[PDB]
Design a protein around this motif. Sequence first.
Motif, short mmCIF file in Angstrom:
data_model
loop_
_atom_site.label_atom_id
_atom_site.label_comp_id
_atom_site.label_asym_id
_atom_site.label_seq_id
_atom_site.Cartn_x
_atom_site.Cartn_y
_atom_site.Cartn_z
N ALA A 11 38.43 43.72 32.76
CA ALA A 11 37.84 42.45 32.31
C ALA A 11 38.24 41.28 33.20
N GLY A 12 37.42 40.22 33.15
CA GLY A 12 37.67 39.03 33.93
C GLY A 12 39.04 38.47 33.64
N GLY A 13 39.82 38.23 34.70
CA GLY A 13 41.07 37.50 34.58
C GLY A 13 42.31 38.32 34.25
N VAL A 14 42.18 39.65 34.19
CA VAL A 14 43.35 40.47 33.84
C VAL A 14 44.36 40.58 34.99
N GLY A 15 43.91 40.25 36.20
CA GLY A 15 44.78 40.24 37.36
C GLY A 15 44.50 41.34 38.36
N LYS A 16 43.25 41.76 38.45
CA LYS A 16 42.84 42.78 39.43
C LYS A 16 43.15 42.34 40.86
N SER A 17 42.66 41.16 41.24
CA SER A 17 42.93 40.60 42.57
C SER A 17 44.40 40.41 42.84
N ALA A 18 45.10 39.91 41.82
CA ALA A 18 46.52 39.62 41.92
C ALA A 18 47.32 40.87 42.19
N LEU A 19 46.94 41.98 41.55
CA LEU A 19 47.59 43.25 41.81
C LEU A 19 47.34 43.67 43.26
N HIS A 27 52.74 39.42 48.10
CA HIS A 27 52.93 38.12 47.47
C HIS A 27 51.93 37.84 46.33
N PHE A 28 52.19 36.82 45.51
CA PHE A 28 51.43 36.62 44.26
C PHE A 28 50.57 35.35 44.18
N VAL A 29 51.25 34.20 44.21
CA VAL A 29 50.66 32.86 44.04
C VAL A 29 49.72 32.71 42.84
N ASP A 33 40.83 32.06 41.27
CA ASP A 33 39.98 32.45 42.41
C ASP A 33 39.17 33.72 42.06
N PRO A 34 38.14 33.57 41.22
CA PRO A 34 37.32 34.69 40.74
C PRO A 34 36.76 35.56 41.86
N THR A 35 36.75 36.88 41.66
CA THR A 35 36.27 37.82 42.67
C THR A 35 34.79 38.13 42.54
N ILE A 36 34.09 38.13 43.67
CA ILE A 36 32.74 38.66 43.69
C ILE A 36 32.83 40.12 44.11
N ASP A 57 38.21 45.54 45.31
CA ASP A 57 38.60 44.65 44.23
C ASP A 57 37.33 44.07 43.64
N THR A 58 37.00 44.45 42.42
CA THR A 58 35.70 44.09 41.86
C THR A 58 35.72 42.89 40.92
N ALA A 59 34.53 42.48 40.48
CA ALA A 59 34.39 41.37 39.53
C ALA A 59 34.49 41.89 38.11
N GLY A 110 48.49 48.23 32.31
CA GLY A 110 48.72 47.09 31.46
C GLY A 110 49.40 46.03 32.31
N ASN A 111 48.65 45.00 32.71
CA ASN A 111 49.18 44.01 33.65
C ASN A 111 49.73 42.82 32.90
N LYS A 112 50.44 41.96 33.63
CA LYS A 112 51.06 40.73 33.12
C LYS A 112 52.24 41.00 32.18
N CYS A 113 53.02 42.02 32.49
CA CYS A 113 54.07 42.44 31.57
C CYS A 113 55.27 41.50 31.69
#
Length: 161
Positions: A11-19, A27-29, A33-36, A57-59, A110-113
Amino acid sequence: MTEYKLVVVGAGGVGKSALTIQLIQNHFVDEYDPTIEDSYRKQVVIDGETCLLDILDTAGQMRDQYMRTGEGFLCVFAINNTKSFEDIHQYREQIKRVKDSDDVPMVLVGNKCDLAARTVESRQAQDLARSFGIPYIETSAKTRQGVEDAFYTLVREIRQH
Ligand SMILES: Nc1nc2c(ncn2[C@@H]2O[C@H](COP(=O)(O)OP(=O)(O)NP(=O)(O)O)[C@@H](O)[C@H]2O)c(=O)[nH]1
Ligand SMILES: [Ca+2]
Ligand SMILES: [Mg+2]
């Protein structure tokens, strides 16, 4: 060299790009910045095997095209977002439907732990992962906990398929 076509979904915003950014750019930051659609190709060495990770890395938000081509899927939810966990079923189903396969290499993430305010219990996702016959791995794109674990496990599932 051996190539592994990995797809990160969820789902949107779970941290796919961030992973992914944490894996490839160490690195994280914290930023919006939504992914297309974005492609990372990195030569790595995993268990002594030199290989090319080709990660799409998908949307979260035309997914049949990218799914079809995929070897292994990182299915990501966030532990502070019950909807994204509930949305996990639909991504697996859509991956099965496009891959015509009960058993595609897949990891439940399960991200954002790192976050204190958990709404999805680990046992809960563990039970779900077991019912899928796939590993469950908790991650933090922020601290990098479990990140290499999630991706390398997926590569290993692809090797054992
Ligand atoms: N605390 C914490 N925040 C995280 C973590 N991973 C991502 N975030 C934050 O959550 C937000 C969304 O992350 P992002 O990677 O863009 O999510 P996404 O699933 O790729 N979104 P999209 O589907 O739009 O591309 C950002 O503020 C990001 O910094 C994590 O492990 N911990
Ligand atoms: Ca089909
Ligand atoms: Mg993204």
